[PDB]
């Protein structure tokens, strides 16, 4: 197994996957690493099994059809994995916890949103369709863009949104376009 957390890249109290060499902090894995379960398989492993069981699940899909999907167990898992892929970027720190807004010339967003709130919402099964989760994720970056205006700090929202969007297209096998 690796000697660092796959998500945050630090050592510590790590739980090792039984089917691949990754390790995790307890609350870095999504969902949080399960109490018992020997062998234990990480989210990466569980996603790869889905693909192996249904190779046609990798054929291209339309984003509009993906969004309307109900959050059955396989879609729940895919959204957890996509959330986890965002936390894997170190720049996710800026978007993890509850923000506050007091900048000359700007007003805070009407609907603040942050990664740990999305994580809670997934854990609590509050999204009934893929669209719910994707809307809250894109709201994070849109609020950041609007608040920071011409400050160069706006670029951190562009960067982390690009990681979200590339991983969304991969995980949900969105049809490639020009
Ligand atoms: Zn970690
Ligand atoms: Zn694994
Ligand atoms: Zn199949």
PDB file of C-alpha atoms and ligand atoms in Angstrom:
ATOM      1  CA  UNK A   1       0.000   0.000   0.000  1.00  0.00           C
ATOM      2  CA  UNK A   2       0.945   3.687  -0.387  1.00  0.00           C
ATOM      3  CA  UNK A   3       2.237   5.438   2.777  1.00  0.00           C
ATOM      4  CA  UNK A   4       0.296   8.664   2.087  1.00  0.00           C
ATOM      5  CA  UNK A   5      -3.471   9.513   1.713  1.00  0.00           C
ATOM      6  CA  UNK A   6      -4.526   9.409  -1.911  1.00  0.00           C
ATOM      7  CA  UNK A   7      -6.664  12.585  -1.459  1.00  0.00           C
ATOM      8  CA  UNK A   8      -4.568  15.012   0.689  1.00  0.00           C
ATOM      9  CA  UNK A   9      -1.099  13.432   0.168  1.00  0.00           C
ATOM     10  CA  UNK A  10      -0.196  13.432   3.868  1.00  0.00           C
ATOM     11  CA  UNK A  11       0.656  10.574   6.202  1.00  0.00           C
ATOM     12  CA  UNK A  12      -1.259   9.783   9.318  1.00  0.00           C
ATOM     13  CA  UNK A  13      -3.822   7.181  10.451  1.00  0.00           C
ATOM     14  CA  UNK A  14      -4.424   5.492   7.075  1.00  0.00           C
ATOM     15  CA  UNK A  15      -6.873   2.771   5.994  1.00  0.00           C
ATOM     16  CA  UNK A  16      -5.575   0.608   3.235  1.00  0.00           C
ATOM     17  CA  UNK A  17      -7.599  -0.746   0.293  1.00  0.00           C
ATOM     18  CA  UNK A  18      -7.539  -4.569  -0.027  1.00  0.00           C
ATOM     19  CA  UNK A  19      -7.846  -4.567  -3.819  1.00  0.00           C
ATOM     20  CA  UNK A  20      -5.455  -1.826  -4.849  1.00  0.00           C
ATOM     21  CA  UNK A  21      -2.455  -0.026  -3.288  1.00  0.00           C
ATOM     22  CA  UNK A  22      -4.217   3.204  -2.226  1.00  0.00           C
ATOM     23  CA  UNK A  23      -4.673   4.389   1.333  1.00  0.00           C
ATOM     24  CA  UNK A  24      -6.931   6.993   2.952  1.00  0.00           C
ATOM     25  CA  UNK A  25      -7.591   9.050   5.880  1.00  0.00           C
ATOM     26  CA  UNK A  26     -10.949   8.088   7.399  1.00  0.00           C
ATOM     27  CA  UNK A  27     -12.759  11.328   6.410  1.00  0.00           C
ATOM     28  CA  UNK A  28     -10.702  11.853   3.144  1.00  0.00           C
ATOM     29  CA  UNK A  29     -12.385   8.779   1.591  1.00  0.00           C
ATOM     30  CA  UNK A  30     -15.944   9.335   0.412  1.00  0.00           C
ATOM     31  CA  UNK A  31     -17.966   7.756   1.788  1.00  0.00           C
ATOM     32  CA  UNK A  32     -16.008   7.820   5.193  1.00  0.00           C
ATOM     33  CA  UNK A  33     -14.015   4.532   5.521  1.00  0.00           C
ATOM     34  CA  UNK A  34     -16.360   1.773   6.717  1.00  0.00           C
ATOM     35  CA  UNK A  35     -16.064   0.449  10.347  1.00  0.00           C
ATOM     36  CA  UNK A  36     -15.524  -3.233   9.558  1.00  0.00           C
ATOM     37  CA  UNK A  37     -15.606  -4.961   6.071  1.00  0.00           C
ATOM     38  CA  UNK A  38     -12.605  -7.281   5.439  1.00  0.00           C
ATOM     39  CA  UNK A  39     -11.693  -7.194   2.640  1.00  0.00           C
ATOM     40  CA  UNK A  40     -12.390  -3.445   2.102  1.00  0.00           C
ATOM     41  CA  UNK A  41     -12.424  -2.001  -1.390  1.00  0.00           C
ATOM     42  CA  UNK A  42     -11.952   1.837  -1.954  1.00  0.00           C
ATOM     43  CA  UNK A  43     -14.135   3.967  -4.194  1.00  0.00           C
ATOM     44  CA  UNK A  44     -11.631   3.742  -7.079  1.00  0.00           C
ATOM     45  CA  UNK A  45     -11.970  -0.030  -6.965  1.00  0.00           C
ATOM     46  CA  UNK A  46     -15.793   0.120  -6.732  1.00  0.00           C
ATOM     47  CA  UNK A  47     -15.979   2.420  -9.769  1.00  0.00           C
ATOM     48  CA  UNK A  48     -13.711   0.164 -11.846  1.00  0.00           C
ATOM     49  CA  UNK A  49     -15.937  -2.875 -10.950  1.00  0.00           C
ATOM     50  CA  UNK A  50     -19.026  -1.014 -12.384  1.00  0.00           C
ATOM     51  CA  UNK A  51     -17.232  -0.476 -15.650  1.00  0.00           C
ATOM     52  CA  UNK A  52     -15.998  -4.088 -15.769  1.00  0.00           C
ATOM     53  CA  UNK A  53     -19.478  -5.468 -15.101  1.00  0.00           C
ATOM     54  CA  UNK A  54     -20.963  -3.267 -17.865  1.00  0.00           C
ATOM     55  CA  UNK A  55     -18.422  -2.270 -20.499  1.00  0.00           C
ATOM     56  CA  UNK A  56     -21.093  -0.468 -22.537  1.00  0.00           C
ATOM     57  CA  UNK A  57     -21.494   1.991 -19.621  1.00  0.00           C
ATOM     58  CA  UNK A  58     -18.432   3.664 -21.204  1.00  0.00           C
ATOM     59  CA  UNK A  59     -20.189   4.520 -24.460  1.00  0.00           C
ATOM     60  CA  UNK A  60     -20.898   8.253 -24.856  1.00  0.00           C
ATOM     61  CA  UNK A  61     -23.856   9.853 -23.133  1.00  0.00           C
ATOM     62  CA  UNK A  62     -25.638  13.121 -23.392  1.00  0.00           C
ATOM     63  CA  UNK A  63     -25.194  15.441 -20.350  1.00  0.00           C
ATOM     64  CA  UNK A  64     -28.912  16.210 -20.343  1.00  0.00           C
ATOM     65  CA  UNK A  65     -29.776  12.523 -19.892  1.00  0.00           C
ATOM     66  CA  UNK A  66     -27.147  12.068 -17.158  1.00  0.00           C
ATOM     67  CA  UNK A  67     -28.459  14.960 -15.135  1.00  0.00           C
ATOM     68  CA  UNK A  68     -31.992  13.578 -15.088  1.00  0.00           C
ATOM     69  CA  UNK A  69     -30.917  10.250 -13.654  1.00  0.00           C
ATOM     70  CA  UNK A  70     -32.274   9.291 -10.273  1.00  0.00           C
ATOM     71  CA  UNK A  71     -29.749   8.867  -7.523  1.00  0.00           C
ATOM     72  CA  UNK A  72     -29.830   5.055  -7.348  1.00  0.00           C
ATOM     73  CA  UNK A  73     -26.760   3.384  -5.713  1.00  0.00           C
ATOM     74  CA  UNK A  74     -24.533   3.473  -8.822  1.00  0.00           C
ATOM     75  CA  UNK A  75     -25.176   7.157  -9.473  1.00  0.00           C
ATOM     76  CA  UNK A  76     -24.742   7.983  -5.766  1.00  0.00           C
ATOM     77  CA  UNK A  77     -21.353   6.290  -5.950  1.00  0.00           C
ATOM     78  CA  UNK A  78     -20.345   8.130  -9.116  1.00  0.00           C
ATOM     79  CA  UNK A  79     -21.194  11.477  -7.477  1.00  0.00           C
ATOM     80  CA  UNK A  80     -19.188  10.545  -4.378  1.00  0.00           C
ATOM     81  CA  UNK A  81     -16.252   9.707  -6.604  1.00  0.00           C
ATOM     82  CA  UNK A  82     -16.536  12.960  -8.588  1.00  0.00           C
ATOM     83  CA  UNK A  83     -16.653  14.889  -5.238  1.00  0.00           C
ATOM     84  CA  UNK A  84     -13.586  13.004  -4.104  1.00  0.00           C
ATOM     85  CA  UNK A  85     -11.715  13.852  -7.348  1.00  0.00           C
ATOM     86  CA  UNK A  86     -12.257  17.569  -6.554  1.00  0.00           C
ATOM     87  CA  UNK A  87     -10.884  17.181  -2.985  1.00  0.00           C
ATOM     88  CA  UNK A  88      -7.879  15.486  -4.504  1.00  0.00           C
ATOM     89  CA  UNK A  89      -6.767  18.869  -5.938  1.00  0.00           C
ATOM     90  CA  UNK A  90      -5.009  20.953  -3.348  1.00  0.00           C
ATOM     91  CA  UNK A  91      -6.790  24.090  -4.548  1.00  0.00           C
ATOM     92  CA  UNK A  92     -10.006  22.584  -3.193  1.00  0.00           C
ATOM     93  CA  UNK A  93      -9.052  24.039   0.177  1.00  0.00           C
ATOM     94  CA  UNK A  94     -10.464  27.339  -0.885  1.00  0.00           C
ATOM     95  CA  UNK A  95     -13.887  25.847  -1.496  1.00  0.00           C
ATOM     96  CA  UNK A  96     -14.111  23.262   1.322  1.00  0.00           C
ATOM     97  CA  UNK A  97     -15.486  25.136   4.275  1.00  0.00           C
ATOM     98  CA  UNK A  98     -18.216  27.788   4.771  1.00  0.00           C
ATOM     99  CA  UNK A  99     -17.244  31.066   3.133  1.00  0.00           C
ATOM    100  CA  UNK A 100     -17.870  34.605   4.244  1.00  0.00           C
ATOM    101  CA  UNK A 101     -18.208  37.690   2.159  1.00  0.00           C
ATOM    102  CA  UNK A 102     -16.974  41.254   3.066  1.00  0.00           C
ATOM    103  CA  UNK A 103     -15.175  42.876   0.184  1.00  0.00           C
ATOM    104  CA  UNK A 104     -15.457  46.510  -0.899  1.00  0.00           C
ATOM    105  CA  UNK A 105     -17.485  46.711  -4.125  1.00  0.00           C
ATOM    106  CA  UNK A 106     -18.996  43.197  -3.952  1.00  0.00           C
ATOM    107  CA  UNK A 107     -21.994  41.617  -2.379  1.00  0.00           C
ATOM    108  CA  UNK A 108     -22.067  37.958  -1.278  1.00  0.00           C
ATOM    109  CA  UNK A 109     -24.032  35.331  -3.166  1.00  0.00           C
ATOM    110  CA  UNK A 110     -27.680  34.689  -2.491  1.00  0.00           C
ATOM    111  CA  UNK A 111     -27.014  30.989  -2.061  1.00  0.00           C
ATOM    112  CA  UNK A 112     -23.593  30.191  -0.583  1.00  0.00           C
ATOM    113  CA  UNK A 113     -22.250  26.736  -1.232  1.00  0.00           C
ATOM    114  CA  UNK A 114     -19.180  24.807  -0.333  1.00  0.00           C
ATOM    115  CA  UNK A 115     -17.674  21.276  -0.668  1.00  0.00           C
ATOM    116  CA  UNK A 116     -18.282  20.118   2.876  1.00  0.00           C
ATOM    117  CA  UNK A 117     -21.960  21.089   2.511  1.00  0.00           C
ATOM    118  CA  UNK A 118     -22.191  19.007  -0.676  1.00  0.00           C
ATOM    119  CA  UNK A 119     -20.429  16.131   1.144  1.00  0.00           C
ATOM    120  CA  UNK A 120     -23.060  16.330   3.970  1.00  0.00           C
ATOM    121  CA  UNK A 121     -25.840  16.510   1.466  1.00  0.00           C
ATOM    122  CA  UNK A 122     -24.632  13.357  -0.295  1.00  0.00           C
ATOM    123  CA  UNK A 123     -24.106  11.505   2.997  1.00  0.00           C
ATOM    124  CA  UNK A 124     -27.660  12.452   4.076  1.00  0.00           C
ATOM    125  CA  UNK A 125     -29.147  11.299   0.667  1.00  0.00           C
ATOM    126  CA  UNK A 126     -30.598  14.812   0.003  1.00  0.00           C
ATOM    127  CA  UNK A 127     -30.159  14.672  -3.784  1.00  0.00           C
ATOM    128  CA  UNK A 128     -32.778  12.750  -5.706  1.00  0.00           C
ATOM    129  CA  UNK A 129     -31.210  13.277  -9.156  1.00  0.00           C
ATOM    130  CA  UNK A 130     -27.686  13.756 -10.512  1.00  0.00           C
ATOM    131  CA  UNK A 131     -28.782  17.294 -11.499  1.00  0.00           C
ATOM    132  CA  UNK A 132     -29.044  18.307  -7.752  1.00  0.00           C
ATOM    133  CA  UNK A 133     -25.472  17.427  -7.057  1.00  0.00           C
ATOM    134  CA  UNK A 134     -24.069  18.919 -10.271  1.00  0.00           C
ATOM    135  CA  UNK A 135     -26.009  22.186  -9.755  1.00  0.00           C
ATOM    136  CA  UNK A 136     -24.606  22.652  -6.225  1.00  0.00           C
ATOM    137  CA  UNK A 137     -21.073  21.869  -7.457  1.00  0.00           C
ATOM    138  CA  UNK A 138     -21.274  24.364 -10.324  1.00  0.00           C
ATOM    139  CA  UNK A 139     -22.793  26.950  -7.899  1.00  0.00           C
ATOM    140  CA  UNK A 140     -19.611  26.848  -5.838  1.00  0.00           C
ATOM    141  CA  UNK A 141     -17.527  28.096  -8.758  1.00  0.00           C
ATOM    142  CA  UNK A 142     -20.122  30.498 -10.140  1.00  0.00           C
ATOM    143  CA  UNK A 143     -20.491  32.273  -6.709  1.00  0.00           C
ATOM    144  CA  UNK A 144     -16.667  32.606  -6.571  1.00  0.00           C
ATOM    145  CA  UNK A 145     -16.488  34.133 -10.054  1.00  0.00           C
ATOM    146  CA  UNK A 146     -19.172  36.624  -9.369  1.00  0.00           C
ATOM    147  CA  UNK A 147     -17.862  37.744  -5.934  1.00  0.00           C
ATOM    148  CA  UNK A 148     -14.178  38.155  -6.870  1.00  0.00           C
ATOM    149  CA  UNK A 149     -14.950  40.119 -10.092  1.00  0.00           C
ATOM    150  CA  UNK A 150     -11.689  41.338 -11.504  1.00  0.00           C
ATOM    151  CA  UNK A 151      -9.416  40.129  -8.707  1.00  0.00           C
ATOM    152  CA  UNK A 152      -6.971  37.600 -10.070  1.00  0.00           C
ATOM    153  CA  UNK A 153      -8.207  35.227  -7.249  1.00  0.00           C
ATOM    154  CA  UNK A 154     -11.159  34.542  -9.575  1.00  0.00           C
ATOM    155  CA  UNK A 155      -8.817  32.168 -11.424  1.00  0.00           C
ATOM    156  CA  UNK A 156      -8.868  29.642  -8.552  1.00  0.00           C
ATOM    157  CA  UNK A 157     -12.609  29.056  -9.360  1.00  0.00           C
ATOM    158  CA  UNK A 158     -11.810  28.485 -13.047  1.00  0.00           C
ATOM    159  CA  UNK A 159      -9.096  26.031 -12.175  1.00  0.00           C
ATOM    160  CA  UNK A 160     -11.039  23.909  -9.708  1.00  0.00           C
ATOM    161  CA  UNK A 161     -14.184  24.007 -12.025  1.00  0.00           C
ATOM    162  CA  UNK A 162     -12.017  22.642 -14.830  1.00  0.00           C
ATOM    163  CA  UNK A 163     -11.047  19.657 -12.598  1.00  0.00           C
ATOM    164  CA  UNK A 164     -14.697  19.070 -11.762  1.00  0.00           C
ATOM    165  CA  UNK A 165     -15.781  19.234 -15.435  1.00  0.00           C
ATOM    166  CA  UNK A 166     -13.054  16.934 -16.794  1.00  0.00           C
ATOM    167  CA  UNK A 167     -13.821  14.358 -14.123  1.00  0.00           C
ATOM    168  CA  UNK A 168     -17.609  14.662 -14.696  1.00  0.00           C
ATOM    169  CA  UNK A 169     -17.103  13.930 -18.405  1.00  0.00           C
ATOM    170  CA  UNK A 170     -14.883  10.909 -17.545  1.00  0.00           C
ATOM    171  CA  UNK A 171     -16.898   9.358 -14.764  1.00  0.00           C
ATOM    172  CA  UNK A 172     -20.288   9.724 -16.473  1.00  0.00           C
ATOM    173  CA  UNK A 173     -18.861   8.876 -19.934  1.00  0.00           C
ATOM    174  CA  UNK A 174     -20.102  12.031 -21.556  1.00  0.00           C
ATOM    175  CA  UNK A 175     -19.919  11.914 -25.420  1.00  0.00           C
ATOM    176  CA  UNK A 176     -16.787  13.578 -26.688  1.00  0.00           C
ATOM    177  CA  UNK A 177     -17.325  16.715 -28.831  1.00  0.00           C
ATOM    178  CA  UNK A 178     -15.289  19.375 -30.667  1.00  0.00           C
TER     179      UNK A 178
HETATM  180 ZN1  LIG B   1      -6.144  12.560   3.635  1.00  0.00          ZN
HETATM  181 ZN1  LIG B   2      -8.855   0.365  -4.031  1.00  0.00          ZN
HETATM  182 ZN1  LIG B   3     -23.829  -4.428 -19.386  1.00  0.00          ZN
END
